[PDB]
Write a protein that binds this ligand. Sequence first.
Ligand SMILES: [Zn+2]
Lengths: 349, 109, 45, 387, 57, 69
Amino acid sequence: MFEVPITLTNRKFAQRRKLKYQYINYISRRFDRISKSDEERKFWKKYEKPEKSFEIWRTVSSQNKQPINKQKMTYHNFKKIEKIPLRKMEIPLLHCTKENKLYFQSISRGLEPLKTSTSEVRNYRTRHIVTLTDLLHLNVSRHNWSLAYKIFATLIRIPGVQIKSLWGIGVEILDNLSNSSSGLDFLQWMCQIYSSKSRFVQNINYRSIVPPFQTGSRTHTAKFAITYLWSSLINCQKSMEPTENDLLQELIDKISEWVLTPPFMEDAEVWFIYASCHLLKADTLSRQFVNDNKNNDLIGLDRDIKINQVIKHIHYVRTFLKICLDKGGFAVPSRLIENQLKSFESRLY
Amino acid sequence: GLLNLGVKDIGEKVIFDGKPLNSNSGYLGNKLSVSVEQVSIAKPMSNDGVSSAVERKVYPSESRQRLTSYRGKLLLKLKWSVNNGEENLFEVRDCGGLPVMLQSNRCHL
Amino acid sequence: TLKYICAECSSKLSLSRTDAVRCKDCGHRILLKARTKRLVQFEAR
Amino acid sequence: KLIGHEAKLLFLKSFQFILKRQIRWLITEMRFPKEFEHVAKIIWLKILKTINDQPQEELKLQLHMTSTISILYLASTHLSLPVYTCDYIKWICTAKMPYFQASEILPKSWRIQLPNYYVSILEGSISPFNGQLYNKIALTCGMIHFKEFFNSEISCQGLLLKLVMQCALPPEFYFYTKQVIEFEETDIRNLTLWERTDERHTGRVSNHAELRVLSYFMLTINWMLSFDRDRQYPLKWILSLTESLTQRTTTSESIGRNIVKVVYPDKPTSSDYFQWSEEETLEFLKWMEKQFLPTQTSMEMTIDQKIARRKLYKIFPLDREDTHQLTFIEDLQERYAKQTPFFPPARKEAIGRLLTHIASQLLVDFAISKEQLKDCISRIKNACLHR
Amino acid sequence: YFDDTLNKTKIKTYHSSEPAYIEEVNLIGDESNKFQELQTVSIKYRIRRTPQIGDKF
Amino acid sequence: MIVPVRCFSCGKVVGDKWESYLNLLQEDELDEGTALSRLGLKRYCCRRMILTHVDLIEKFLRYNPLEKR
Ligand SMILES: [Zn+2]
């Protein structure tokens, strides 16, 4: 039942997509006229590519560009547009297999296929892989840690894994695996596995990797690289302030290497997550110099070199939170962080 | 750091397209003031073959054995200001390999 | 068997005229030519 | 890298070799001496004879993933050691055959023989559907003229035993079905392997002996239980058998049948897929970590990618980041004990319920035809009423 | 080495006043785009220096 | 580099007296003078040979490229 690790047996699906598009450019062309392989690339050039996310969700409040289009659909008017594209789909419909003739005659009637293409492929290698992908998803849906990674560990040794669920079940399985590994390692191995510092979107028929859940290093954030930083700050928090340390610095220098290109380059949590790691580094230093005036009765301890190191940092953080707002970052509820930071300043006094 | 003060001292470099416009015909063929906000330096990394690869930290032992420079990519956040503010453009430009001082705040050691 | 050690992986290997000069265990591009059992005469001074 | 006649020659050659490798694991498995080995040799020697004759530029002879097992099957028929469904399930379960992947070769090189569009098209293309193996066997017999050369093929009083033990093994239904077989089952004579269906249309003449054996088997059960006037088989007895049946571990066998079920085909075992009775789940992952361990040795990565891959496996390396389960005759014993309390509309329903189940079982080892099977059933139904 | 243009096995001669021993042979494919033929090699020689008449101390 | 075989000036074999001497400064917690007196380096040619030694080989040895690290 679940999402499979592999390029989709490219055989009938590629010619079903010819007939689908070729009809859509034919029927649409005559809608454009009434208003007054390559076809598939032209269909996407007529509706653009998919930004770095999922569904071109964007507000729902700005432009009230009125659509009352007058329903404009008189059964009689639809069959005027349709009567000629269907006879031009029969030319290519004849050269197509008997299975693809009716598949086209089903989708051109508006029927949808209850025939999951991944419910017929009969290829040994593929065969199993569907069993393993479903096995591991039914095992994390009951938290079976000792069996879920056995299935996970075998699923990647078989030639059919594109990061895919490997990066999305390979991390939790390591959070649920109380034993060996911190999705982190696996997360940092992924980051190096798919930097994709190259800005590639659009162009060709992404039909092998179409999930904003692997890819990027162009603009479109990688979400395993954002999860690597988020899991890393949460891995820094646990049992700090409750020279072998370094981690909150390691994370300050592992974003420093970035400082925009693709990540710096693109805004948000990149900036925000960085400030948040930085804000935590300011609190720890107020604790390590907090309780009952620093530790206790005063400091005499050479004025307060430690207050100046912290005020520099508080002033720096406020710069990172501000540039993350300015550059269009909707992520941060500024009111709460500023109140927290000022009430914390009041601990440093 | 000092280098950002330096770029704060270079200021601006302004150029006018002889904005024709048909004062609008000799009072600005549209101002374009270009400057540099930040300058970034990264520790030596090496990508294999092309770039579509994940980079590795480059160590001095490597530069000596290879008998080559120990270079860091120099980057600088370019500000492209158009018509005094009509258009702002940011660019992280790679300025080739800057020889980095060993054991510096920019050397892995 | 000729041998070439990876300057960065310590992995022993046996390069050929038909392969890329890289450590198959590390990926390094610098190789020390290994010493072998080869006779050399020496005046003990 | 190659093509035409000479390509065809090593395409030929490679086919030659894998079958040879297939045969020797054959001997190790059941150990059936020179005999199994040499009969298999000459069988293909005979097969080769035909290929040379229609040569010139005859390229009709690349063998189907199935032709090889049909060959071994026919030869086993030369000797009559086993069965087809059992052999097939066993083979899939233990990958006993080198059948599914053709990388073994000894070719590394035959591989490159730029396996043209012949060498590449082998050892592991896909799993059999319907007849599939039933049609090729007939073709092999035709080319082979196997029946004349071959003594008593498709017979086996052993398939009947395999079948009764298969489930509701009744110390009586072996003789029942043997008797109806006795009856109109080829004038009370051991079914011989069908003929050399020379014609390319491969009509469903329905002469594959076993297919009919299973048909008589099924028929016998419901007839028998559908007319046990004396009431020798209690109402509540029939469902108990189907009950106990309700799938259970398998001293190797049932685990195998799960592995065959996972060719996910007509969805009769698909759901078993998801259900997959806990451990069945576990011993499954065990058999995956042992027998798709060589899922592939190799190349790629260009002195890196490979390293990365290794590291990755490095990482989630895992594989461990009553001897418990039982044998075949143990399970068999314990369910005939689970029924050992032996001494209207509902029973008819129960009988139909039970028959569908066996239809699942016997059909599942084989090329099924959620109809042909039925068609097959229909056929002898008709054959029978000429008393 | 061998250059196809000359169809000859040619050698780079050692030019020094005294004999040495080959201490290290280092294979450099680095900074290269492919260069897999290993055309650059750095060779380190160990030349012994015995205390001798005229050496400064 | 390594404890010299013989004292340049005298000729006395000295290479045998290194580890025990180091042991004697460790194990016997002795002083350099008394340690050398028990070692028999009763000449300053033989005294200086070991006293001045710097067995830098331990620093060289950590660079061994023939083992992974
Ligand atoms: Zn001395």
